[PDB]
Amino acid sequence: GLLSRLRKREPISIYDKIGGHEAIEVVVEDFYVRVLADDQLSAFFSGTNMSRLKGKQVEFFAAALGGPEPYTGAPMKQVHQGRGITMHHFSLVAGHLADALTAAGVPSETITEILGVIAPLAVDVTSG
Numbered sequence: 001g002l003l004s005r006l007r008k009r010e011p012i013s014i015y016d017k018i019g020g021h022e023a024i025e026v027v028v029e030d031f032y033v034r035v036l037a038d039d040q041l042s043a044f045f046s047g048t049n050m051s052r053l054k055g056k057q058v059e060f061f062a063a064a065l066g067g068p069e070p071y072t073g074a075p076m077k078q079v080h081q082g083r084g085i086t087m088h089h090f091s092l093v094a095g096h097l098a099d100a101l102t103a104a105g106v107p108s109e110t111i112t113e114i115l116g117v118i119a120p121l122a123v124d125v126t127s128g
């Protein structure tokens, strides 16, 4: 709880400052409308239950951004290993994320802050 967290004098999480759970659901719908609309990335999600993924991804980003909700998915290295995902691909994905965040009116300093929280994860997402 935001209020309870501030009662304990803990610093505001990225999760809170952008609107917690529901802000993230909304971004994630847009995000995937943008990823699935992109011809360089579409194919990747050909054999995928998107509803299941969106659910899993709301959990991951929420978790990653400071939320109290649990990730109930597979590890990042494993799911992405062998899918031929390159940095070129990682970055385009990181683009739609940002556009989606921007479109949700999230300030750019905070978008840039989320990107720098996700970026490291590339090591686990790409091949090289």
Ligand code: HEC
Residues within 6 Å of the ligand: 041, 044, 045, 047, 048, 049, 053, 056, 057, 060, 072, 073, 074, 075, 079, 080, 085, 089, 090, 091, 093, 118, 119, 121, 122, 125
């Ligand atoms: C364009 C390729 C691509 C990029 C870039 C990528 N992923 Fe994914 N990822 C996939 C695909 C495809 C799946 C679904 C595979 C399946 O259907 O089982 C997936 C699955 C996932 C899942 C759910 C895993 C599960 O347990 O089902 C999460 C969470 C996730 N990715 C997060 C991320 C995060 C966080 C990043 C960036 C830091 C990222 N992905 C970058 C292609 C990508």
Ligand SMILES: [C-]#N
Residues within 6 Å of the ligand: 053, 057
């Ligand atoms: C991203 N899945």
Ligand SMILES: [K+]
Residues within 6 Å of the ligand: 078, 079, 080, 081, 082, 083
């Ligand atoms: K895999």
Ligand SMILES: [Xe]
Residues within 6 Å of the ligand: 024, 027, 028, 061
């Ligand atoms: Xe997000």
Ligand SMILES: [Xe]
Residues within 6 Å of the ligand: 027, 028, 031, 057, 061, 097
């Ligand atoms: Xe996302």
Ligand SMILES: [Xe]
Residues within 6 Å of the ligand: 093, 094, 097, 118
């Ligand atoms: Xe992402």
Ligand SMILES: [Xe]
Residues within 6 Å of the ligand: 115, 116, 119
């Ligand atoms: Xe980044």
